[PDB]
Amino acid sequence: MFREMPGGPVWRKHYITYRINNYTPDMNREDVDYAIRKAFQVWSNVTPLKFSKINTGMADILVVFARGAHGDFHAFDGKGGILAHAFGPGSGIGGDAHFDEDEFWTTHSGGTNLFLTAVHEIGHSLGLGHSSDPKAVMFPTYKYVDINTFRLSADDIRGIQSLYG
Ligand SMILES: CC(C)[C@H](NS(=O)(=O)c1ccc2c(c1)sc1ccccc12)C(=O)O
Ligand SMILES: [Zn+2]
Ligand SMILES: [Zn+2]
């Protein structure tokens, strides 16, 4: 009762497209796109895939930020608890996930880093289950650092390598 698995854009588990039809009026909107472009790269760097964003149309997964609530989902509980969410990516209005802005963000980091989190969120995208504790970017602030200082560990590399490149 869920075998359904369609896809409009280049969907083949190999290439995943991401589109941001919205951001949030509080910080450089470009800093939200740039880091997302540098984030999807972290994966291509260690994978022979190709993730690209279309200027307009339908993308494998739609990203949208908001605060308080946004119709979809049972609405965020507020600041705390969860920091992000991700629904089964593959169904029509399913991949079009949304990020919880109910918290205080800052491109300068400090609070909740969206960059480090970026690579984490994508982890679920590639149906990547969770590990035990291999100091993976999953761990809370495994390596809290700027976006240009972002670096993976040999342990986090032992998880993805499971694909053999
Ligand atoms: C959605 C939720 C159940 C869970 N994610 S989480 O617990 O919200 C979760 C897990 C990892 C990280 C954050 C939030 S915030 C952050 C900053 C830097 C690096 C890592 C992370 C999940 O992995 O599915
Ligand atoms: Zn949402
Ligand atoms: Zn995770």
UniProtKB/Swiss-Prot annotation:
Chain positions recorded as Ca(2+) 3 binding sites: 77-78, 80, 82, 100, 103
Subcellular locations according to the entry: Secreted, Extracellular space, Extracellular matrix
Source taxon at top rank: Eukaryota
Species this protein is from: Homo sapiens
Tissue/organ expression: Found in alveolar macrophages but not in peripheral blood monocytes.
Domain statement: The conserved cysteine present in the cysteine-switch motif binds the catalytic zinc ion, thus inhibiting the enzyme. The dissociation of the cysteine from the zinc ion upon the activation-peptide release activates the enzyme.
Binding site for Zn(2+) 2: 120, 124, 130
Ligand binding (Ca(2+) 2): 60, 92, 94, 96
Function: May be involved in tissue injury and remodeling. Has significant elastolytic activity. Can accept large and small amino acids at the P1' site, but has a preference for leucine. Aromatic or hydrophobic residues are preferred at the P1 site, with small hydrophobic residues (preferably alanine) occupying P3.
Family: Belongs to the peptidase M10A family.
Residue numbers binding Ca(2+) 1: 26, 101, 103
Residues annotated as binding Zn(2+) 1: 70, 72, 85, 98
Active site: 121
Induction of its expression: By exposure to bacterial lipopolysaccharides (LPS). Inhibited by dexamethasone.
Parent-record interval covered: 100 to 263 of 470
Protein's UniProt name: Macrophage metalloelastase
